Amino acid sequence: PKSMQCKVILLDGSEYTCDVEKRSRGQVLFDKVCEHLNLLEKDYFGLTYRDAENQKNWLDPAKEIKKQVRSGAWHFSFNVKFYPPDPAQLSEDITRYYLCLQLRDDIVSGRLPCSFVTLALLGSYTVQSELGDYDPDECGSDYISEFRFAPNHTKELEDKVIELHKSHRGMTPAEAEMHFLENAKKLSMYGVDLHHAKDSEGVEIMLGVCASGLLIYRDRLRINRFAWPKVLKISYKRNNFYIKIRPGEFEQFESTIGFKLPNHRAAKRLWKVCVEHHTFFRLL
């Protein structure tokens, strides 16, 4: 029974290595990673891989690993797939911990934009969680934390993290993680998966997929939002992704909005993440 070596980048930046039979489905590897992580609330998470075009793909747990990674290495990341709109409702602290690690990467990477004050507040809760109570000993007037807090670090941001850290005396790791999440969850790009596209006139837009629906970023002045309820039907054909929108009360016919994606695989990928989010956020 021939087994393939799998390497998984965990949310703390460390590598987990295991073996699975070469005809294994993605669920087999995912179950092994989740057990390694002592994670029970597995529904929010998944494994990503990079395809032959270097795009991030979700590893489908129901399909053979080999028929997804195809010609590529058996190298994966462990990621949040469905960002809970109310992290306080998760049953375990360890779930909330992994969600925090994902969000810290979302922030440092610039996928999750954040004001100066919110970067420093989020930062201060991570420090409280990881080091415990503020200690003046590990912080002179020239302190810079090992912790990555932001896509661009400034001495002013480092100072503001420390100032807010001082206010969190007595806060336990679970408490600090919950405060982190209560703030992060409110950010306008929280849990938003962004896809480059063109509208039916060839104008460059972004399509965002999240818990509440599909977003269309045309410009800062023009953001259309389709709650899952309003979305009747979704489909892809060639390089195109089409969305059917419910008629308003006492309108006869649905509207179709068509989008052009970079290529057929980018269209299919957007279609599948939409399918997944609708099913998830219709059951949650």
Ligand SMILES: NC(=O)N1CCN(c2ccc(F)cc2)CC1
């Ligand atoms: N198999 C079926 O009978 N349905 C058809 C509609 N479909 C859907 C998917 C995504 C979305 F955004 C809106 C609707 C769910 C599956």
